[PDB]
């Protein structure tokens, strides 16, 4: 895996791909 | 209304919620 | 949950707001 | 709903989500 | 218009509703 | 050729049409 | 319409150009 | 077809749409 | 694990591979 | 190929790395 | 946090793993 | 190359055709 630059909707796409059926929390500062 | 599934469901959550944040929990 | 309401069934953006923090 | 910053393909995704089966016109200036 | 507002600034989903059929 | 549906169909329209604009009309 | 030609059936990017303004 | 400004994931989406079942190589410099 | 198809499969490849580049070959 | 392993079946991001250049 | 790191800088998929259930 | 042209500048779908199998 590479380091990624991920803003906005791209970040939540990445979380979806990583977490899958486990689900995830999106929590911006 | 539309069916929103997987990556499309979370992009709709981002849209609606934005910097409020959100939770995506299939198991719920 | 969300998958049942929005993916299996259909839902509005208003319904989607229920999953906001 | 929050205010959104939406450029290019992200704007048309948003229009798709809002308008749904109603359809929509994409008309940049 | 609202289109350009969205990208240079911010816009609401309500504003986008103006573009539906 | 591919099947292009929903959000994928409009992103293909954006790509092809760009600043010409486009119409997406399922009812048509 | 577009859904029948491009989603139900398949279509080329050339066919897609028919929906440009 | 119009000229397009395409970075990152948007470029690979475009390659997918153009190439289809033919497949493609993504090769950044 | 999830099913990753079409445009979703290549965006997952971009994510994982990045500036390493990748190949998408359905015929393989 | 990738379609069989990742789309038809399922695969991990580790499996996806096998298609990196 | 990692969220902001991702957008202002870079982040790993490993870091994103911290946000799963 | 064309890849970098696309992001720093603009490119055509025709140019992208050069990357298909
Ligand atoms: Cl972007
Ligand atoms: Cl899909
Ligand atoms: Zn983007
Ligand atoms: Zn999809």
Author numbering:
A (entry chain B), D (entry chain B), H (entry chain B): 1 to 29
B (entry chain D), F (entry chain D), I (entry chain D): 3 to 30
C (entry chain C), E (entry chain A), G (entry chain C), J (entry chain C), K (entry chain A), L (entry chain A): 1 to 21
Which sentences did the original study use to describe this structure?
Electron diffraction allows protein structure determination when only nanosized crystals are available. Here, we collected continuous rotation electron diffraction data from protein nanocrystals of bovine insulin, thermolysin from Bacillus thermoproteolyticus and thaumatin from Thaumatococcus daniellii. For insulin, we also compared the electron diffraction results with X-ray diffraction results obtained from micrometre-sized crystals obtained from the same preparation.
The structure of bovine insulin was determined by both X-ray and electron diffraction using crystals from the same batch, i.e. grown under the exact same conditions. The X-ray structure was refined at 2.3 Å resolution, which was sufficient to yield a reference structure for the electron diffraction structure. The asymmetric unit contains two insulin molecules as well as two zinc ions and two chloride ions located on the crystallographic threefold axis and 23 water molecules. The electron density of these insulin crystals is well defined for all amino acids except for residue 30 of chain B and residues 1 and 2 of chain D. In our insulin X-ray structure, a zinc ion was observed in both chains (B and D) at full occupancy. This zinc ion (and its symmetry mates) lies on the crystallographic threefold axis and is coordinated by His10 NE2 (Zn–His10 NE2 distance of 2.05 Å). The zinc B factor (28.8 and 27.8 Å2) is similar to that of His10 NE2 (27.8 and 28.5 Å2). The similarity of the B factors of zinc and His10 suggests strong binding of the zinc ion. The insulin structure refined against electron diffraction data at 3.25 Å resolution agrees well with the X-ray structure refined at 2.3 Å resolution in this study (r.m.s.d. of 0.38 Å on Cα atoms). Moreover, the overall B factor estimated from the Wilson plot is higher for the electron diffraction data (71.9 Å2) than for the X-ray diffraction data (35.6 Å2), suggesting that the crushing step and/or the loss of zinc ions may have introduced some disorder into the insulin crystals.
